[PDB]
């Protein structure tokens, strides 16, 4: 039912777990997760993935 050749790039997942997730919760917000303690201001900052 989801055989998309080249990958269906519509199914997502939070690769970078910012913190622990409360049961049944759902977060929908895109923001660069800084790993070098620097102001991302977008994606320009270092380690802002």
């Amino acid at each position: 039912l989801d055989s998309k050749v080249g990958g269906n790039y519509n199914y997502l997942y939070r690769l970078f777990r910012k913190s622990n997730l409360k049961p049944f919760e759902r977060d929908i917000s895109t923001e660069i997760y800084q790993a070098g303690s620097t102001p991302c201001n977008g994606v320009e900052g270092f380690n802002c993935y």
């Epitope: 039912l1 989801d2 055989s3 998309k4 050749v5 269906n8 519509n10």
Partner: antibody, heavy 119, light 110 residues
Framework: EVQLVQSGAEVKKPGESLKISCKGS????????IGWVRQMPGKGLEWMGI????????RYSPSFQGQVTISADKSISTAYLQWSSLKASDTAMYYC????????????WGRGTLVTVSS | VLTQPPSVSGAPGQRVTISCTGS?????????VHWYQQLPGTAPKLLIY???NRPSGVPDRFSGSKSGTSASLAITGLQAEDEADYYC????????????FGTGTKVTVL
């Protein structure tokens, strides 16, 4: 080449079977949604079902359940259309076209079977 | 299930939007819309899919778009080969059926 060929024109009576070979090539057969679509003469396209050669998984249609027979042969990578009993009004063209999961469209269509069936 | 104008007329060199007006589960639900070029006397040929993508062999004069609950196929510079029939179709979650096809839009060149 990627081509889905059909059978020739046939005239016959309701009740008997009509077998159609729609050979598939140029793509991984067990990885694409192969299916049949029917069109009445001078009308629109109506969906019958799509079958997956990996598991013979068939999702038929509300208005076309219990009326037609579908199957596939992954041994020869050919799609099979069969009928347990035809009808006089069943004179219409049937197309075997391969779709893809997600976005659910036929990327390629077969030539189609022009079949005339009457009493 | 997808209603469409039975006959759409277009002069050569004119741009017309083939209105794919649908319900709240076929177009308005955010689902993607696809078009097939039912050339008369033959089998339909894929012309627009994904509302923005164009397959190999489709000229750029062919185009597609989505407008809320309706979709439009923009065709620019109608020629003799453009006399063809179009079925917009999409996916319906509520009817269980993977595939739902439009009523159709016969296109004639004036």
């Amino acid at each position: 080449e990627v081509q889905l060929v059909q059978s020739g024109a046939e005239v016959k009576k309701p009740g008997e079977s009509l077998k159609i070979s729609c050979k598939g090539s140029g793509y991984s057969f067990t990885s694409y949604w192969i299916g049949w679509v029917r069109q009445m003469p001078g009308k629109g396209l109506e969906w019958m079902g799509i079958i997956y050669p990996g598991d013979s998984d068939t999702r038929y249609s509300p208005s076309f359940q219990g009326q037609v027979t579908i199957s596939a042969d992954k041994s020869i990578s050919t799609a099979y259309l069969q009928w347990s009993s035809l009808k006089a009004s069943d004179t219409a063209m049937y197309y075997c076209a391969r779709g893809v999961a997600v976005d659910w469209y036929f990327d390629l269509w077969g030539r189609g079977t022009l079949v005339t069936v009457s009493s | 299930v997808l209603t469409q104008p039975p006959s759409v007329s277009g002069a050569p060199g004119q741009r017309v939007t083939i209105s794919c007006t649908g319900s709240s589960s076929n177009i308005g639900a955010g689902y993607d819309v696809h078009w097939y070029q039912q050339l008369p006397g033959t089998a339909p040929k894929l012309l627009i899919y994904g509302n923005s993508n164009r397959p190999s062999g489709v000229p750029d004069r062919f185009s597609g778009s989505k407008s809320g609950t309706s979709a439009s196929l923009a065709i620019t510079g109608l020629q003799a080969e453009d006399e063809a029939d179009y079925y917009c179709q999409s996916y319906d979650s509520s009817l269980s059926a993977l595939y739902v096809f439009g009523t159709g839009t016969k296109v004639t060149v004036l």
